[PDB]
Structure formats: C-alpha cells, structure tokens
Amino acid sequence: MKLTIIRLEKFSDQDRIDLQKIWPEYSPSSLQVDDNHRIYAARFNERLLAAVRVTLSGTEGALDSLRVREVTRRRGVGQYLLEEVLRNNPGVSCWWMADAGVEDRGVMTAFMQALGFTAQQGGWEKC
Amino acid sequence: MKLTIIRLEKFSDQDRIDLQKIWPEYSPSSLQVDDNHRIYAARFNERLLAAVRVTLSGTEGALDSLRVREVTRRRGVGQYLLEEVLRNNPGVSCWWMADAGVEDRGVMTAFMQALGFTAQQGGWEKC
Amino acid sequence: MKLTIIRLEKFSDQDRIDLQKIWPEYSPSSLQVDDNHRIYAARFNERLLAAVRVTLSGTEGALDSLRVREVTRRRGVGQYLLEEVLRNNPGVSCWWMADAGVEDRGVMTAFMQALGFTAQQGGWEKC
Amino acid sequence: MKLTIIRLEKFSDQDRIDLQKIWPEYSPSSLQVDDNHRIYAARFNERLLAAVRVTLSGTEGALDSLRVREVTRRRGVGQYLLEEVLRNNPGVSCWWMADAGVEDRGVMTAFMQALGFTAQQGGWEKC
Amino acid sequence: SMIRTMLQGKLHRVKVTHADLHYEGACAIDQDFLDAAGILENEAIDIWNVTNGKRFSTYAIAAERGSRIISVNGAAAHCASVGDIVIIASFVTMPDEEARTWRPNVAYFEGDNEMKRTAKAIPVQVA
Amino acid sequence: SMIRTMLQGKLHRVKVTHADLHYEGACAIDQDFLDAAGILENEAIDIWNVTNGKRFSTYAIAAERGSRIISVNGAAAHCASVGDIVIIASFVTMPDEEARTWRPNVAYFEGDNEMKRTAKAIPVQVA
Amino acid sequence: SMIRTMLQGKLHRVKVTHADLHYEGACAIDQDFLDAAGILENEAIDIWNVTNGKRFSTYAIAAERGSRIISVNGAAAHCASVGDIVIIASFVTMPDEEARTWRPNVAYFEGDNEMKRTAKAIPVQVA
Amino acid sequence: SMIRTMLQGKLHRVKVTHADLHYEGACAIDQDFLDAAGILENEAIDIWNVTNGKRFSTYAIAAERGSRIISVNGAAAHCASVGDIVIIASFVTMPDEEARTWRPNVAYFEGDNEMKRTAKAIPVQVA
Ligand SMILES: CC(=O)SCCNC(=O)CCNC(=O)[C@H](O)C(C)(C)COP(=O)(O)OP(=O)(O)OC[C@H]1O[C@@H](n2cnc3c(N)ncnc32)[C@H](O)[C@@H]1OP(=O)(O)O
Ligand SMILES: CC(=O)SCCNC(=O)CCNC(=O)[C@H](O)C(C)(C)COP(=O)(O)OP(=O)(O)OC[C@H]1O[C@@H](n2cnc3c(N)ncnc32)[C@H](O)[C@@H]1OP(=O)(O)O
Ligand SMILES: CC(=O)SCCNC(=O)CCNC(=O)[C@H](O)C(C)(C)COP(=O)(O)OP(=O)(O)OC[C@H]1O[C@@H](n2cnc3c(N)ncnc32)[C@H](O)[C@@H]1OP(=O)(O)O
Ligand SMILES: CC(=O)SCCNC(=O)CCNC(=O)[C@H](O)C(C)(C)COP(=O)(O)OP(=O)(O)OC[C@H]1O[C@@H](n2cnc3c(N)ncnc32)[C@H](O)[C@@H]1OP(=O)(O)O
Ligand SMILES: [Mg+2]
Ligand SMILES: [Mg+2]
Ligand SMILES: [Mg+2]
Ligand SMILES: [Mg+2]
C-alpha cells in the first residue's frame, strides 16, 4: 500500500528482517516496546523503509535512531515519518533529538530545520 | 445533460433546493408563475446553475433577478440563458433590466453590453 | 473503397445521380458509349468524384469534359484520373484536349502542364 | 528470436539457404566442421545474418570469412558475433584475422579497431 | 516549458450516418462540423461511443459540406454502427501558461446531426 | 531536445460518486482535488479502475469546490460504476534534462474522498 | 504555439505475411514500404486490423527491401494472424499553421503486398 | 519542425516478479534495468504482455537496485500475473532530422531477470 506511518507494538518476521536492514547495529528484540518507548516505522508496499524510536515523559519527548533506508532517501519519507510522530503525540510540547549515531550531521540539520527544529549543542529541539 | 435553457412552470424538490442556492433572498414558492411572469433557468447535469425572471407585456418585457452561481461564472452560462430568453420571446421588441440587487454594476454592464443592451439610467435596454 | 479509376460501360442509378452532379449540362443517357467513345470516372467510397470523355482514333485520342467536383479539388483526383486514362490507352501516342467549356483556363493550363501537356492554340497536346 | 550467436555443427536447409547468401563464393557443404574448425553465425528471427570461420590451435586462433549481410550492417551484429566468438574461446590468447577477401579494408580496420585488434601487415591481431 | 495536453474541441453526440468496412479512412466528417470544432483534415481524433461503450482513435477526413455525414470507415467500422451516438474529440499541446487560459471549441448536436450550439467552455458540475 | 512524457500528477484511489450516460463530459472532479494534483480544467487525463480493471482516457472538467465529486460522465460511464475506486493521472512533456529532476503532484485519498496526504515523490519499492 | 497531431503517413491494406510470438519486435516492414509512407525505423506506429477489428500501437523495424514482409512479432502476434489485412499509420506533431497545409504520405496496396499507388491527399467523401 | 515519436528504450522479455492490487503505482522496476534502457522514474511506459496479450500504459517507479523486481501494482495488476513475460518500452519525441539517426536503448533478459545484453539497434528482418 501507499506510504503509511505505523506504530509497531508487535513485529512480524518481515518486520524483523526489515528492521535489521534499517538498523544493522540493533538485534530485535533487544528492542523493548511499552507504552512510553515506541517505535514508529514507514511502511510502503508491505516493507519498512524507515524507523525511529520515541521516548515519552508526558510533555517531553525524545527521538533517537531516525533512519531512512539509503535507497529511498529524498523522497519525503523521513519528513512524513516525523510529522506523523509529532501529530500522533499531541501531548508532547517539547521534543529533543540528540545527534548520536548520525552519519552526516550537516544533512541532519538541514532536515531537522525543514521540520522546524532548532540546532542546539548536542542535538535538535522543537519546544 | 448538456447546458439547456428551460422555462420552469412547476418545480421539483431538486428545483427548490437549486433556486434557494441561486436566490437565497427568495422563498419558493413565494415565486408566482403564470403566462406573463416566467422563470427561465440554466440546467446542467440535472442541476440549475442560473435563473432569471421574465415579465411580459406584449411588445415590452422586463428582466430581473439574473444570477449565475459564483462557482460557474464566465463559462458562457449567463449569455446562453439570456439569448434563449430573447429568442423564445420573439414578440418582445423592447427589453428592460433594472439595475436592482446587482452586486457589481461594472461587471453587469460589460455583460449586458456583450449581449447588445445599452446602459441607461437605472438599467439596461435593448429596444 | 479507395480512389479508383473505372471505365463506365453501363451506368447504375447512383452513377446517373453522380454524373448529373459532375456534368449538370448533360442529360444521361444523351451520353453514348461504345468502343471508341469512352467515359472514365474517379470513384471514391461508392461515389463518382470526376469524369472525362475519351474519343479514340487509333494512335490519336481526344479528351473533353474533364471535371472534378469542386468540393474535392486539389487532392490529386484529376491527376490520377488522367494518368489512368493515358496508361490504359497505351496505343495512343498523340493526345488532344480542346479548351472548350473550361471555367478557368489559367488553372487548366497549370494542371495540363503538371501532366506534361503543352499549351497550344485552342487546347493542350501531348504527342 | 532476438539476435543470438550460435555455433553451427549441423546445417538445416534454412541454414544452407542463409549461408549461400552470406557466402555466395562457398558451396555448402564444401564447409568442413570439426572440433577445431568452427562456424559461428548470428541468428535473428529464424534467419542467419552473419557468419565467420574459426580455426583453433590451442592458445592461437584464426578468423576468416567474416561477413554481415549488407542489408543489416551497422546495427551491431558484426560486433556481437565477434565478442561471442572471443568470449566463448577463452583458451585463445592470441587471435589473427588475415585481410583476405575483404571488400573495404578501410571499414574493416575501423571495425577491428573498435573490437581492440591492431592493424598489422596482412591482417589484424589481438594478442 | 512543461507542455500540457488539452482538449482542443469536440463534437458532442453526433450520429453515425455510414459505417462500412470497405470504405477508405477512417472517419469522414461534414466539413461544417470540423470547422465548428476547430478539427483539421488529417488530424488525430478520438471517438467515444455512447451507444456501445467503445473508445478508439483514428484521424479525420472531410465529407462534403452540408451533407451531415459521420462516416466510420475501414477497420473502425468494427467499433460503430449506423445510428450510434458518438463524441469526437481532438487534443492539442501547449505550454502550461497558455493551458491555464485555454478555451476548447465545442459543438452540440441533436436529432439528425443538427448543430444546436457552439461554445467555448463547459460549465462546472455542482452538487 | 529529446522530449519525455512524465507523470504530472495523480489522484490516488478516489471513489466514483456519480456515473451517468446522460451527463455531459467526461470526468467532473472537485476543484480542490484538481488543484492538489496540478490537473487543469479541460486537460487530458487517464483513468485506471482498480475495482474492475478498465483503463481509459478522457479529459477533466471542474466540479464544485468541496463537493468531493468524481463524476464519470457520458460514454465513460460504460467504464465505471458508482463506488469504484479509481486512479486519475495526467502527463506532461518536458526536455530530458528537466525530466531527470521532475517531481509529480500526488494526492492520497481514503474513505469518502477525504484527502489524506499530498506529496511530491513516490518511494522506492524494496525487496 | 498550439501543436496538432497529424497523420504523417499510412500503409493502406497490407497483408500480414508472418506472425510469431517468438520473434523480436514488434512490426517488421519492407523497407520500400516504410520509405513510401515516410515511416522511420524505430518510429511508433498504430496498427488497425480490418480483418478482426483490433487496434494496437507498437514501433516499426526494417525488413529486407523487396521482401514484401509485414511481420507482426512478439506480443503483437496476439493481435493479428497471417493473411490479415491491416492499416499501418504514424503520426507527427507540428504547429497549427503548418498543420493546415500538411499532406500525408499515403501508400495503397493490393494482392500480395503490391504497391499500387502513392499519394499526398485523401479525397473528400461526398453524399 | 515536424516532431516524431521514437522508441527510446525497452526491456525485452522481463518476468513479472510481483503483482498486487493493493500496492501503490504502477510498475516498479529495478533501478539497474531502468538505467540500462534509459527509462526514468515517473516516466510513461507501455507494457506489452507476451504471455496473455494485454497492452497497457502506466508510468515507472524505482525498485531497489539489484532486486530484479518487476512489480505490477494497483489497477495494472488486473493486466498481468506473477511469472508473465513482458516487454516494457518508453517513447520520446524529437525533430525528424534527429529521428533519422536515433538509436534506442535496448536491454535483453533471460531466466530470472538476468540481463544478457544491451544494444543500440535492432537488426533488419530478412526473408
Ligand atoms: C542507530 C541509528 O539509526 S543512529 C541514527 C542514524 N541516522 C542517520 O545517520 C541519518 C541518515 N540519514 C537519513 O536517514 C535521512 O537522510 C534523513 C532522515 C536525514 C532524511 O530522510 P529523507 O527521507 O531522506 O528526507 P526527506 O526527503 O523527507 O527530506 C525532507 C526535507 O529535508 C531536507 N533534506 C533531506 N535530505 C537533504 C539533503 N541531503 N540535503 C539538503 N536537504 C535535505 C530537504 O528540505 C527536504 O525537502 P525537499 O526534498 O523538499 O528538499
Ligand atoms: C435577487 C437577485 O438575483 S438580484 C440580481 C443579482 N445579480 C447579480 O448581482 C449579478 C451577479 N453576476 C452574475 O450573475 C454573472 O456574473 C453575470 C450574469 C453578470 C454574468 O454571467 P456569466 O455566466 O458569468 O457571463 P458569461 O461568461 O456568459 O459572459 C459572457 C460575456 O459577458 C462578459 N463578461 C462576463 N463577466 C465578465 C467580467 N467579470 N468582466 C468582463 N466581462 C464579463 C464577457 O464579454 C463575456 O464573454 P467572454 O467570456 O467571451 O469574455
Ligand atoms: C461540360 C464540361 O465538363 S466542360 C469542361 C469543364 N472543366 C473545367 O472547367 C475544369 C474545372 N476544374 C477542374 O475540374 C479541376 O480544377 C482540374 C481538373 C483542373 C484539376 O483537378 P484537381 O483534381 O483539382 O487537380 P489535382 O489536385 O490532381 O492537381 C494536380 C496538379 O495540378 C496542378 N493544379 C491543380 N489545380 C491547380 C490550381 N488551382 N493552381 C495551380 N496548380 C494547380 C498542381 O500542380 C497539382 O499538383 P499539386 O497539388 O501537387 O500542386
Ligand atoms: C568469403 C568472405 O566472406 S571474405 C570476407 C569478406 N568480408 C568483408 O568484406 C567485410 C564486409 N563488411 C562487413 O561484413 C561488415 O561491414 C563488418 C563485419 C565490417 C562490420 O559489421 P557490422 O555488423 O556492419 O558492424 P557493427 O555495426 O557491429 O560495427 C561496430 C563498430 O564498428 C565500427 N564500424 C562498422 N562499420 C563501420 C563503417 N562503415 N565506418 C566506420 N566504422 C564502422 C563502428 O565503431 C561500429 O560502432 P558504432 O555503430 O557504434 O559506430
Ligand atoms: Mg525519502
Ligand atoms: Mg458562466
Ligand atoms: Mg482533387
Ligand atoms: Mg550490423
């Protein structure tokens, strides 16, 4: 189906294969999911193309491990994933993403700016 | 069906709904219809897009309340409605439309001129 | 069917109607046809568009009354009719057309020239 | 079928007709075929368009009688035939074609150069 | 310099008058009708059959001015019968800037191919 | 100056709301939907029916802004029924250089023609 | 700068000589025939089958000059059989000004693909 | 300035790997395959099905480089099944002068979408 943002609470074996490609450094299910530790993923034609982890603390929210598969970058996937994360957590009024793991901090900043985040020491904020 | 000019002698409920949109200021059937007080309407795909009232006095004829729905203006509907009114009342050799109710007298004059009417005090004439 | 040159030896009623349009001045069958007095016609989609009369005297041949319907001129019909007449009378080595009846002698000469005829007093020749 | 390079070990009657057109100077089967004397041919829509004879001597290989039908030249057929000959005799590290029979030595040299052969006295070499 | 494909003109609901497999090519149209819709002799046209649902593309030729002929000819006669109601359209290309203000040539027919109305715009369909 | 044909924009999975053989021409589309996909009034559009498999070409007209109407009209109503799910596309031409960086206008629909998402790119399908 | 699509040329009523699913691409045409109709190798052509009614589009390749071959190849061989009578056309685009004086290249065939006539215009169909 | 429509490139006899009504749009093609045939993401392509005879037009999207995927998606999945053998083509327009020397990008496939050969010309079919 068309590009869709989903919250993954349980993982199929396809999901497991896809998440290994998106996140080679992590071993599912080292990945914990509960009500405050979320994983959102972009799904397109029964495959995941991008993922991010979300940590909620009421009005504060942290983002880490945002990654879009190299093959499908600059097609708006990253942006749609993040907007759906913001939109579906309307309780959060302050978001943080630390610059950890980021390949290319220059690209990340231009992306986070398009989405309205301000660059700060160690990260990006929208708050 | 294609754009058609009709004389309405009886009104369906669709006609009533359509005439309320064309003429919010009037309450059908406050609207009297007899042999000398006519209503002509432009019909397109089972809906009315424009209407006008016609009063006949033999060789003299009055027009009032000419209105085309805003959404479908400048597509020739107003012009076709008026030509069919003139053509189908070939006994009338003198026509008058008073400038009453007119939103934009500037637009009206350019329209009535395209149709061959002369601007006069209080109205337009073709005679 | 496609444009075809035919020798008419017998005339249908369609042929009669068509020849009246091509030749209003003649009354079929005032028109005599035998082995030396021929009528060739251009036929297109079961109608005649052009006709000419051919008189043969062995190695000499006369053409008269060449006419293509006004509606279908300058589409190559006249030229094809004449080529088929020449081609199908390969015994004739000298052809004459008199300028009689011709509307526009200027147009006729340019046509007869395209076909390789020389203008002469009273006519055209190819010989 | 699409353009295909084949090694002909037996010849149909179509093959015989085709080889006569490609090689009018030879009479099949004057043409000997064994393990060291090969004929490769370009086949396209059940017809042969080009042929060449191959003589193998272990690491040395000779080519003669390369010809593409005139009608289908400069469509890449000659080049594909030769590449498939080289590719399918990977044991041969030194190839020779003598300039015998060649119509247009100028065209041949530009072709053999495109394929990486060097012009030499009496022929072309890739070695 | 993005180029759009725009409806140039249409003949709305003409009746097929002739259909014959043996005629040449491929829709013959009364001259007056072509002029009304801005369609040219030899131009590509699309034909949509309201009677039987078939949609096919061909090119237009002229039929005699005033004949009212819609002749569906050759292979196309598999797609329509005498008396079918069809829509005939052509399409042109132009830069986006011109396309935003383009007005098509539209002609409306009733009864025995009687041209009822020409216009330059199609109204908006309302709820 | 090689010119490519590029997907200009699409309405993805709209529902047919009306279909009637007696309506004029040939797909009426809510104004807002046309704007979202960059499609113009009178532009050629292709319609692909997911419900029944039919693929046909027509041209677009406007329907009243906010109506959500997808009206399949005239001959086209042989190709779709009320409630069918369709994709509507238009295509433009541009030089190869511009085509390599072109981004189409894409609009996504769910439920009762509710526009869910607009975008400028389609993701890459992964294994 | 409105651009029209015009019939460039046609082969009128040729006979299919070969049809095979296993051949490559997609209509092979005698060279002489292509020249007569101004059709180019690799050009898009439309094929209209008079024998069975099918209408399809493909592209032309050359067949050997003088062979008289009309070979319908690959997927297209689902659309025609050996002996079917077809019309082959191509279309070009040009500015409206040039289109008004355009003359197509037309070639007429009979019997075993014998070219009978070339011409530059199609006559007018008369009542 | 007559403009021709020329075969730009083709993928010859690829195998459909996926077909699903529920996927978005409308043929996803391995990146490497697009490059080989000069076909662009979002470009209009024609698909000819050798297995079942269907001919339809759509537009191309990218699939992951090296996947070998030919995915027939959305409404198009009514026209092809997993394992069907198809030909994929695109077409471009260029002036007649350039068209006479144009060479298409052609790619040939065997077995499990293994690219066997790229070329720039199709040979001439001989008798
Ligand atoms: C374990 C871990 O995962 S640690 C975390 C590691 N993560 C990373 O290293 C990030 C690697 N990069 C990525 O994943 C992607 O490149 C992202 C998330 C930065 C961007 O995702 P995308 O889907 O490619 O971006 P998207 O196309 O949605 O971009 C939207 C906007 O961002 C901006 N943008 C994105 N990429 C770029 C770029 N390379 N240069 C400039 N601007 C850019 C543009 O404004 C763009 O809008 P446009 O296409 O209209 O210009
Ligand atoms: C209770 C009551 O109803 S009181 C009466 C109230 N009525 C009003 O206030 C009138 C409101 N306006 C309207 O209804 C419409 O705008 C009308 C009747 C003036 C015009 O109807 P339309 O269908 O829009 O006009 P149509 O497209 O037929 O115009 C024909 C010609 O008129 C002229 N014309 C129309 N609108 C304009 C304009 N806005 N500016 C300049 N010329 C115009 C043009 O010459 C046009 O021909 P073109 O399109 O070839 O240039
Ligand atoms: C009772 C009786 O019938 S009396 C005889 C009366 N006949 C007449 O008065 C002749 C009336 N005119 C006609 O019938 C036609 O105009 C004819 C026969 C002169 C020409 O027939 P057409 O079918 O129109 O000519 P066709 O298109 O075949 O012309 C071929 C060539 O002739 C020349 N030609 C024809 N018409 C013209 C013209 N009007 N101006 C210049 N050259 C012309 C051109 O070279 C043309 O080739 P082109 O189109 O490649 O330029
Ligand atoms: C008994 C006997 O047979 S004796 C042997 C007799 N043989 C001969 O006389 C050879 C006659 N000529 C031929 O058969 C052909 O012309 C050949 C074999 C030289 C070339 O075959 P083709 O299939 O036409 O060549 P092909 O199209 O594959 O050419 C590939 C490259 O060769 C070069 N080439 C081929 N022909 C030419 C030419 N005429 N001029 C310049 N370069 C050329 C080009 O680089 C070309 O690549 P391009 O099209 O990308 O420019
Ligand atoms: Mg992306
Ligand atoms: Mg209007
Ligand atoms: Mg003529
Ligand atoms: Mg060659």
Numbering used by the authors:
A (entry chain B), B (entry chain B), C (entry chain B), D (entry chain B): 1 to 127
E (entry chain A), F (entry chain A), G (entry chain A), H (entry chain A): 0 to 126
What's the paper's own text on this?
We have recently described an additional component in the pantothenate biosynthetic pathway, PanZ, which promotes the activation of the zymogen, PanD, to form aspartate α-decarboxylase (ADC) in a CoA-dependent manner. PanD (encoded by panD) is post-translationally modified to form its catalytically active form, ADC, by cleavage of the peptide backbone between residues Gly24 and Ser25, leading to the formation of a pyruvoyl cofactor from Ser25. The PanD-PanZ protein complex is a cross-shaped heterooctamer, with one PanZ molecule bound to each of the PanD protomer-protomer interfaces. In addition, we show that PanZ acts as a CoA-dependent inhibitor of ADC catalysis.
To confirm that the observed PanD(T57V) conformation when in complex with PanZ is solely caused by the protein-protein interaction rather than as a result of the site-directed mutation, we determined the structure of a second non-activatable mutant, PanD(S25A), in complex with PanZ.AcCoA. Diffraction data were collected at room temperature in-house to 2.1-Å resolution. The overall architecture and major protein-protein interactions were completely consistent between the two complexes (PanD(S25A)-PanZ and PanD(T57V)-PanZ). However, owing to the change in the available hydrogen-bonding interactions, slightly different conformations of the active-site loop were seen. Nevertheless, in both structures one of the two residues at the site of cleavage adopted a Ramachandran-disallowed conformation (Ramachandran et al., 1963), suggesting that the PanD activation region is forced into an unfavored and, therefore, high-energy conformation upon binding of PanZ. This destabilization may lower the energy barrier for activation of PanD to ADC. In the two uncleavable PanD site-directed mutants used in this study, the unfavorable nature of this adopted conformation is reflected by the formally disallowed peptide backbone angles observed for either PanD-Gly24 or Ser25. For both proteins, global fitting with a 1:1 binding model (Houtman et al., 2007) yielded robust estimates for dissociation constants of 35 ± 4 nM for the PanD(T57V)-PanZ.AcCoA interaction and 157 ± 5 nM for the PanD(S25A)-PanZ.AcCoA interaction.
